[PDB]
């Protein structure tokens, strides 16, 4: 049918306010829920309905700053929320020591990302500390972990590392040669990219891999023309009407972005069928509460609401800003970031 | 011990064993964003968790507190880390923890933290004897669970348990020949044991796949495996393949077959074959067949492929 823009704006507004205890399992990643909402409002050109200054202070209260003795550099970055009980501090005073307080790579990424969307200039971000923390997360095989205490490692975090280095406009945060090696080794026999070597290729990891290379500006240099053609074939085969993440799996709204954005980066999204994709995405739209779901007649959530909108954006939906397919922010925001980088270079 | 929903449950704030600890509250400042509202019980457990965590108390009471924290939210990675610290400090029975995590994962098979916890345990015990059977059970609730397949490959690789996997794969492919995860597993086993360079193995596999394709011609997974094990050696180097496929076209046709053919013809043009101008037309004819009637949803893609072949071989 049609895009209920105002309804989606209210939906994101609610997300930034208060959630039911049934969402307690998102506690440690509240910052990424905030990102979905803010970036979502940005994409609909409605950031005006929120108090940018209040939110910026909240975000800065999530930064893990280096202590007086700077003995915790390997653990700096951002927290997903305040669940540890550390006293509110919007990056004003120095870091308060705590045996288990450290950043999370996906939170450092969405955190910096949110600050830029809100207009902040990142002056209160301890760039060197963040990059130090990032370096500490990389493994021998080139991939990354989410936290210094240890976690699983895969393509998801390689993408996070890439976005962080790109936004801070400094690649000292990683050993790019090893990361590229990891990305190459994840290519499957069917030509898609998996979470890691030998694993089943997947739409999510393919996006993470390709987007990471584009952010490093080395797509052409890492994959041959023959290889890129095979990857393109794998990606475009994902469209059934909407998109699925793996062969023989049911379509899911968020893949309209994961795969769609990959196709855009490979410059062949233009050859996909727009109408069937748009029709599928809209069929998952909740006309009553707003937002989108993974499947039609299913409950909506912040993740699918955001990615469904970015999916629509890829096709230039009337009323939605153009999304930067590799950085995952609006192109308007990516432009402001370009200016920010230029200003630093003085 | 004392279950969260037991009629005699008591808040930690009212327990004598916890009288000496001051609970630590969470504070999102003046204007909280994406704030989750918590019940009395929830906030009570975590207010004490914060306290114990903040003082790095390696006690038996702290260990029991994590069990409650996990029941309230198994996605809190910090809680799992601290529990591992305690498992070591108190030298707990890891065989018992295996039973615990085995139950937890069954209730939440799509949680990242629980799979990571089990992997750390197995590394500690250096004991994979339970793994393959456990994963097979989980794969029974969802045969495509990415977490399960990921764990299964880690185990097999780490403890070299290749002996029966190819048989397990054959069994699952009979249950659902369309499960893309199983085809990937098959390639995983073979390339890590015999490899595909052994002409006897390559033939066995190409034959096996053609048999599955004959049973269900419309299956991207089977076609992707077939092209996968041959694309690097060179599709045009297999003359009998081109004809065996052209013979299937009549009955077992599908866009996957037509696509395979286009790819064969292109390999030929790439290797300066005989009848360059004629082969190119056999390809273009197929591309248009895909665009206009076989894979219409990708109409513009196939036409783009066609235009690419012409400007490259003319």
């Amino acid at each position: 049918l049609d895009f209920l823009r105002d309804r989606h704006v209210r939906f994101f507004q609610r997300c930034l306010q208060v959630l039911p205890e049934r969402y307690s399992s998102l506690e440690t990643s509240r910052l990424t829920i905030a990102f979905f909402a803010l970036s979502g409002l940005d994409m609909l050109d409605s950031l005006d309905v929120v108090n940018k200054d209040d939110i910026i202070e909240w975000i800065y209260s999530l930064q893990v700053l280096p202590t007086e003795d700077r003995s915790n550099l390997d653990r700096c970055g951002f927290r997903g929320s305040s669940y540890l009980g550390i006293p509110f501090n919007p990056s004003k005073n120095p870091g308060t020591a705590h045996p288990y307080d450290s950043g999370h790579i996906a939170m450092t990424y969405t955190g910096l990302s949110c600050l830029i969307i809100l207009g902040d200039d990142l002056s209160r971000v301890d760039k060197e500390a963040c990059l130090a923390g990032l370096r500490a997360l990389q493994l021998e095989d080139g991939s990354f972990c989410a936290v210094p205490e240890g976690s699983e490692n895969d393509m998801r975090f390689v993408y996070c590392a890439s976005c962080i280095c790109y936004m801070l406009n400094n690649w000292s945060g990683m050993d790019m040669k090893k990361a590229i090696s990891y990305i190459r080794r994840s290519m499957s026999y069917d030509n898609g990219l998996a979470q890691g070597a030998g694993l089943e290729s997947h739409g999510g990891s393919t996006f993470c891999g390709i987007a990471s290379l584009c952010l490093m500006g080395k797509l052409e240099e890492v994959f041959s023309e023959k290889e890129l053609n095979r990857i393109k074939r794998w990606c475009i085969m994902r469209q059934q009407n909407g998109y699925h993440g793996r062969p023989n799996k049911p379509v899911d709204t968020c893949y309209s972005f994961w795969v769609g954005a990959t196709l855009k980066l490979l410059k062949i999204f233009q050859y996909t069928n727009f109408e069937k994709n748009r029709n599928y995405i809209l069929s998952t739209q909740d006309r009553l509460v707003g937002g989108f779901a993974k499947w039609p007649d299913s409950h909506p959530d912040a993740l699918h609401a955001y990615f469904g909108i970015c999916g629509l954006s890829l096709m230039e939906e009337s009323g939605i800003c153009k999304v930067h397919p590799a950085l995952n922010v609006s192109t308007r925001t990516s432009e402001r970031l370009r200016d920010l980088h230029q200003s630093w270079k003085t | 011990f004392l279950s969260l929903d037991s009629p005699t449950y008591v808040l930690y704030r009212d327990r004598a064993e916890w009288a000496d600890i001051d609970p630590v509250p969470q504070n999102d400042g003046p204007s909280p964003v994406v704030q989750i509202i918590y019940s009395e019980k929830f906030r009570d457990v975590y207010d004490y968790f914060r306290a114990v965590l903040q003082r790095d108390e390696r006690s038996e009471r702290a260990f029991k507190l994590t069990r409650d924290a996990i029941e309230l939210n198994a996605a809190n990675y910090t809680v799992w880390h601290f529990r591992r610290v305690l498992l070591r400090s108190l030298q707990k029975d890891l065989q018992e923890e295996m039973n615990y995590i085995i139950a937890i994962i069954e209730e939440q098979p799509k949680n990242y933290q629980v799979w990571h916890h089990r992997r750390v345990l197995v590394e500690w015990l250096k004991d994979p004897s339970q793994e393959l059977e456990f994963i097979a059970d989980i794969l029974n609730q969802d045969a495509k669970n990415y977490h399960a397949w990921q764990h299964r490959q880690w185990v097999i690789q780490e403890f070299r348990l290749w002996d029966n996997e190819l048989q397990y794969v054959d069994q699952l492919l009979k249950e659902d020949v369309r499960n893309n995860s199983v085809w990937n597993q098959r390639h995983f086993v073979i390339s890590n044991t015999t490899g595909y360079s052994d002409r006897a193995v390559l033939e066995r596999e190409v034959q096996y796949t053609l048999e599955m394709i004959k049973l269900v011609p419309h299956n991207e997974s089977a076609w992707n495996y077939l092209k996968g094990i041959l694309q690097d050696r060179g599709l045009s180097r297999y003359p009998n393949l081109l004809n065996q496929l052209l013979d299937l076209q009549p009955s077992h046709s599908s866009p996957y077959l037509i696509a395979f053919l286009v790819d064969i013809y292109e390999d030929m043009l790439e290797n300066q074959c005989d009848n360059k101008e004629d082969i190119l037309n056999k390809a273009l004819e197929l591309c248009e067949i895909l665009a206009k009637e076989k894979d219409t949803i990708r109409k513009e893609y196939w036409r783009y492929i066609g235009r690419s072949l012409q400007s490259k071989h003319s």
Binding site: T32, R156 | A75, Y112
Partner: peptide, 6 residues
């Protein structure tokens, strides 16, 4: 129902 990515 949902997509847990972390």
């Amino acid at each position: 129902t949902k997509c847990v990515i972390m």
